[PDB]
Design a protein around this ligand. Structure first.
Ligand SMILES: NC(=O)c1ccc[n+]([C@@H]2O[C@H](COP(=O)([O-])OP(=O)(O)OC[C@H]3O[C@@H](n4cnc5c(N)ncnc54)[C@H](OP(=O)(O)O)[C@@H]3O)[C@@H](O)[C@H]2O)c1
Ligand SMILES: O=C(O)COc1cc(F)ccc1C(=O)NCc1ccccc1
Length: 315
């Protein structure tokens, strides 16, 4: 099936288009192309600095009647400097304004780490440490719940939450809406079995980010592992007459995950969508899982001292 049922009753397309690092001068056409070739889910964030341009594409396709709003699933994320309960609504409204929408299908707490509010996405002390917020994440969650009740978002969720942090939300006194989704890094070098099992057992859908290993991540080093160039994954792809990227996208789909590969290249946007016509064997799946190295694309040293930094825990 092309969609997965969320715990709010809505269906979420299991394939979406990522937009982190998509240049503002290219992302409008990227999203237009994606919608033209069948994508119905776009993953966005305020911190990506391109929501206005993403919105231009969505709006044109709605105006052109290529797709109805109800058929789209648009996701964005609350940045760390907006965890203060009194700032959450305004942050959501800014994202809605930029995307030119009157609701989001899903709004995520981007990271469990709250930062000092202000214009800077990463406010630093004079010694280079990120400056935290004293806001409790349970209070941030209550503010997210208000967005559902005010009609700004259809679903709320979390991102980069470790299992104890997910548990904190699930155990929140007076919890009104469970998180619908936990969006986490996941690919054959960071397979996330423990966290995935935990979330799924609680009815939380997992979205896999950086499924191709984020080769355009700005902190990449030449000697880093490369999923797209792994000869073992290439061999599995060859067996199926698919590309390595297509195998990397199909892999999380067969684990009942949502997956959000990013591209601004029209040929690749189309390629990445052509993943509903083959099946990896159980053996293929277990073989891909065996490549786990606990290797993370997404982490940040400046935030490792933050009390809510998610990656000290095993999972
Ligand atoms: N919640 C979070 O904290 C978080 C963190 C990271 C990512 N994300 C989300 O997840 C999305 C995906 O992750 P990502 O952007 O880190 O990396 P990714 O999707 O794993 O990889 C993107 C890179 O792969 C290239 N690529 C795409 N398709 C390809 C294909 N078929 N063949 C060869 N190369 C291909 C892209 O190049 P071109 O664009 O030049 O074609 C780009 O350099 C992000 O854009 C964002 O929406 C969320
Ligand atoms: O956060 C994303 O979606 C992708 O990464 C970025 C995307 C951006 F646009 C800007 C920054 C980052 C970044 O460094 N993230 C790592 C991080 C952020 C916050 C707390 C702990 C680790």
């Amino acid at each position: 099936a092309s969609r997965i049922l969320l715990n709010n009753g809505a269906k979420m397309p299991i394939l979406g288009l990522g937009t982190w690092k998509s240049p503002p001068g290219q992302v409008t056409e990227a999203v237009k192309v994606a919608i033209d070739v069948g994508y119905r889910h776009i993953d966005c964030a305020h911190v990506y600095q391109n929501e206005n341009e993403v919105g231009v594409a969505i709006q044109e396709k709605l105006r052109e009647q290529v797709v109805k709003r109800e058929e789209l699933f648009i996701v964005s994320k609350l940045w760390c400097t907006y965890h203060e309960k009194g700032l959450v609504k305004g942050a959501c409204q800014k994202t809605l304004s930029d995307l030119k929408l009157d609701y989001l299908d899903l709004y995520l707490i981007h990271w469990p780490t709250g930062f000092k509010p202000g214009k800077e996405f990463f406010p630093l002390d004079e010694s280079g440490n990120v400056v935290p917020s004293d806001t409790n994440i349970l209070d941030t969650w209550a503010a997210m719940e208000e967005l559902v009740d005010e009609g700004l978002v259809k679903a709320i969720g979390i991102s980069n939450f470790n299992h104890l942090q997910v548990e904190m939300i699930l155990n929140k006194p007076g919890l009104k809406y469970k998180p619908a989704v936990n969006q986490i890094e996941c690919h054959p070098y960071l397979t996330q079995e423990k966290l995935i099992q935990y979330c799924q057992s609680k009815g939380i859908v997992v979205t896999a980010y950086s499924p191709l290993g984020s080769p355009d991540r700005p902190w990449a080093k030449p000697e880093d592992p490369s999923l797209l160039e792994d000869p073992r994954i290439k061999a599995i792809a060859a067996k199926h007459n698919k590309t390595t990227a297509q195998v990397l996208i199909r892999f999380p789909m067969q684990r009942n995950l949502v997956v959000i590969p990013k591209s601004v290249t029209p040929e690749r946007i189309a390629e990445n969508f052509k993943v509903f016509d083959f099946e990896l064997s159980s053996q293929d799946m277990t073989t891909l899982l065996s490549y786990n190295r606990n290797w993370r694309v997404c982490a940040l040293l400046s935030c490792t001292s933050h009390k809510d930094y998610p990656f000290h825990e095993e999972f």
